[PDB]
Design a protein around this ligand. Sequence first.
Ligand SMILES: *[C@@H]1O[C@H](CO)[C@@H](O)[C@H](O)[C@H]1NC(C)=O
Ligand SMILES: *[C@@H]1O[C@H](CO)[C@@H](O)[C@H](O)[C@H]1NC(C)=O
Ligand SMILES: *[C@@H]1O[C@H](CO)[C@@H](O)[C@H](O)[C@H]1NC(C)=O
Ligand SMILES: *[C@@H]1O[C@H](CO)[C@@H](O)[C@H](O)[C@H]1NC(C)=O
Ligand SMILES: *[C@@H]1O[C@H](CO)[C@@H](O)[C@H](O)[C@H]1NC(C)=O
Lengths: 49, 273
Amino acid sequence: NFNGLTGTGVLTESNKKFLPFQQFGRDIADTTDAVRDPQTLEILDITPC
Amino acid sequence: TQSYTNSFTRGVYYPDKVFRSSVLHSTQDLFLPFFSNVTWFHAIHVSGTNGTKRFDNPVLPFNDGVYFASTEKSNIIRGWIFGTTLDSKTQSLLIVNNATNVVIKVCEFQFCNDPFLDVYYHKNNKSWMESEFRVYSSANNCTFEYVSQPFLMDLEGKQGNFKNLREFVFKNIDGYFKIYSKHTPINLGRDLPQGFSALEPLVDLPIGINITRFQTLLALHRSYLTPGDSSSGWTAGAAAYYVGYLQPRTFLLKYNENGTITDAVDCALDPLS
Ligand SMILES: *[C@@H]1O[C@H](CO)[C@@H](O)[C@H](O)[C@H]1NC(C)=O
Ligand SMILES: *[C@@H]1O[C@H](CO)[C@@H](O)[C@H](O)[C@H]1NC(C)=O
Ligand SMILES: *[C@@H]1O[C@H](CO)[C@@H](O)[C@H](O)[C@H]1NC(C)=O
Ligand SMILES: *[C@@H]1O[C@H](CO)[C@@H](O)[C@H](O)[C@H]1NC(C)=O
Ligand SMILES: *[C@@H]1O[C@H](CO)[C@@H](O)[C@H](O)[C@H]1NC(C)=O
């Protein structure tokens, strides 16, 4: 759970060059791909189980 | 100056915060149509040796947001005023800028006489303009004096033919005020050079006051390197101060692999498009 975004899967650090204003990651079919931690400033890939 | 000039491929901004990569995406938003025309409002020493009025700062309709660009080497342009009244009845917005700071103050500005002006109006002899800005008189009930890092960051110009170009887009919808900004250090010999560049969102200020007029605050003591003419309509000249109006269009954007907009096409300009 991130800021009220429920999900399930595996979390792994990825080399995503997220710009400071950009927060979420998304791809085809409105599927969340990366999230920004509410406390630390880190961007991580999310992959379904 | 009331000339007309073609805006080739400028005026695109990121619609939303979600990151995307290598996807051709279609959106329907307010945008500046490609190959539209823009006017040249100008500031000039209208008999600057005397305190003769210049009327370089008029009032414009503000029909659904405003596009803005400025190409100058100094800090002459600083600050905008907005509002449907600019009177004692209703609030007014001030976006004046400090030396290395900006203050945004929504408050009732009763009387705005005129921008301050040095009677000599010569910058060829003295280059110091110090603490000569007072436009508002009575500050009645108001709140929301937002303060943050300055919008403009001085890109130093050197060696000639190399100055900074500032682009801004002002929108006010559903109680939210958004200001998209971009600095392009590269301008070369063209006031409106060809090329494609996105507009970075900078701030999001909640106010909620309806806007129907705006005016620009210049350092009217002196503004040098200024040609002028009395022509009107579709003419030619130079003003170094532009303006454009947005419309509810539909665009197609090509995000790069890194996540930056590279090309865009409007679905209303050409049958091929
Ligand atoms: C826009 O301005 C151009 C000149 O810059 C003029 O020829 C044209 O009639 C104007 N109106 C349009 C394109 O609708
Ligand atoms: C900016 O200038 C205004 C005008 O005097 C002043 O009220 C404000 O305190 C100044 N702020 C900074 C950070 O310089
Ligand atoms: C501001 O609010 C106070 C309190 O209601 C009122 O007395 C004053 O006239 C108001 N001024 C303006 C300019 O609205
Ligand atoms: C904007 O607000 C003012 C109130 O001062 C009002 O007179 C004006 O009609 C409003 N604009 C529109 C388009 O309704
Ligand atoms: C994406 O950014 C990286 C990091 O600067 C860069 O090496 C790469 O060339 C960029 N991709 C482009 C410009 O297509």
